[PDB]
Amino acid sequence: ACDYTCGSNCYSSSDVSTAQAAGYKLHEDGETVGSNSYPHKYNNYEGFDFSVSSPYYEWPILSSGDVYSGGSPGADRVVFNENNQLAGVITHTGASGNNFVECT
Ligand SMILES: Nc1nc2c(ncn2[C@@H]2O[C@H](CO)[C@@H](O)[C@H]2OP(=O)(O)O)c(=O)[nH]1
Numbered sequence: 648a649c650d651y652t653c654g655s656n657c658y659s660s661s662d663v664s665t666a667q668a669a670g671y672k673l674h675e676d677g678e679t680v681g682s683n684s685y686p687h688k689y690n691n692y693e694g695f696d697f698s699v700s701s702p703y704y705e706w707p708i709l710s711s712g713d714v715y716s717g718g719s720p721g722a723d724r725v726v727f728n729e730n731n732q733l734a735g736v737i738t739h740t741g742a743s744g745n746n747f748v749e750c751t
């Protein structure tokens with residue numbers, strides 16, 4: 648069964664921790680990757696009720712199970728905070744425009 652389901656994409660806990668670790672390292676190093684400069688701040692415009700404190704950052708999680716290294720980041724993101732705590736897994740799939748919904 649999937650720990651998070653983002654549309655048709657199925658992720659386990661280990662998928663999320665792996666993506667999160669890569670993103671947090673770049674954030675700590677003050678480095679970014681990709682044309683959209685990930686990781687970057689996640690403003691929470693959607694008003695998600697995350698159980699950890701802001702500020703939050705987002706980083707792509709990819710269904711191929713590879714770590715994001717540039718190119719298209721697809722629809723799915725992990726959202727982590729300054730303490731490297733996971734806030735949530737969110738996706739553009741199933742939401743209008745460039746909005747997000749949470750993966751379930
Ligand atoms: N919808 C949304 N986009 C955000 C937020 N914070 C930053 N962004 C970035 O702003 C772009 C314009 O909304 C979004 O598509 C998203 O980039 P990503 O595609 O990199 O996730 C947020 O809280 N909500």
Ligand SMILES: [Ca+2]
Nearest residue numbers: 658659662712
């Ligand atoms: Ca996997």
